[PDB]
């Protein structure tokens, strides 16, 4: 009970090192991604998007969940560096065609029934 | 009246060839070279 087999990191301190290593790889890659794919975004927008993705999981405290997130993040990086992804796949992080949905109670009330 | 299905003929079907069949044709190598050399000599003459 509570004794589990690890993936890569035996504790959060070790896991956070892999998070920082992954962040440095993504940070150095955005200039190349915005160049090869000929994206109409800036290097600042891309690096802001990377930061947005990392802060989205800043509340994790289980090292194994962090290990999978780094594993999944490295697969994403490998797909982008080798240009397995297309321009359509790299722009799906920006949701350019999705109309902004309401956030406040009143706006959600007027348009439909969803919470 | 009686059962009627799709069945083989009473005596069965005839033999069906399946084995490879590549018949031998042409002349021997000796004759082929003899004809070609004879053509040259007449051509040269």
């Amino acid at each position: 009970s509570t004794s589990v087999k690890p993936i890569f990191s035996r504790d959060m301190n070790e896991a956070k090192r892999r998070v920082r290593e992954l962040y440095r790889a993504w940070y150095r890659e955005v200039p190349n991604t915005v160049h090869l794919f000929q994206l109409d975004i800036s290097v600042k927008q891309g690096r802001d998007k990377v930061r947005e993705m990392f802060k989205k999981n800043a509340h994790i405290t289980d090292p194994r969940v962090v290990d999978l997130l780094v594993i999944k993040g490295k697969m994403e990086l490998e797909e982008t560096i080798k240009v397995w992804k297309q321009r359509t796949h790299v722009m799906r992080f920006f949701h350019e065609t999705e109309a902004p949905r309401p956030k406040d109670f009143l706006s959600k009330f007027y348009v439909g029934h969803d919470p | 009246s009686k059962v009627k299905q799709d069945m083989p003929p009473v005596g069965g079907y005839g033999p069906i060839d399946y084995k490879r069949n590549l018949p031998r044709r042409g002349l021997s190598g000796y004759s082929m070279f003899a004809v070609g050399i004879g053509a040259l000599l007449f051509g040269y003459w």
Partner: protein
Amino acid sequence: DTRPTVRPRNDVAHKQLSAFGEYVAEILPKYVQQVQVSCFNELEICIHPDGVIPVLTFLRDHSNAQFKSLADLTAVDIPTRQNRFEIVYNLLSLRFNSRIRVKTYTDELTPIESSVPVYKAANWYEREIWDMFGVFFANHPDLRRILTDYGFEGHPFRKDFPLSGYVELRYDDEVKRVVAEPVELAQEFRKFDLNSPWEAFPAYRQPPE
């Protein structure tokens, strides 16, 4: 076995597989948890996840097993189990003209050792298991999605993944590219409740709760 509509039993193979099942459990007691043979003569060895490399190596190399072919490797998702995933190895022995099934288990976070060292065929089967179920295989030469689209989020073959997914693609003329948007169906898939409220097979009746 004279009944036209009923499948005849082969009790010679049933004894042979039962005998060999004990044989494996005697040689690998550290890993073998349960052995069984089905009524259609298929032997199953249920092992601890730690025994993936020892068990498969024995079954491939032992002179009385010689299971040189990995017929297939797949996972089954059973949410009600503490370990929801069930890794299934189907091996074939050409020397003895026999088949054996090796089964283990894991969950969302526990890795399972990669069997590429034992069977080169497991390279893509483990990529498919990871891609479609999210089961991580440790020490895999290169693990990544094999079937799903690039950037696809989630694991489709999990029982809690919806049939139509969460996103769908179209072409948008404003951005001049194919985009991904939340799924809306013109006709919703119609769920049919087909189960009959009367028990079909008394032989499999589970003890009352």
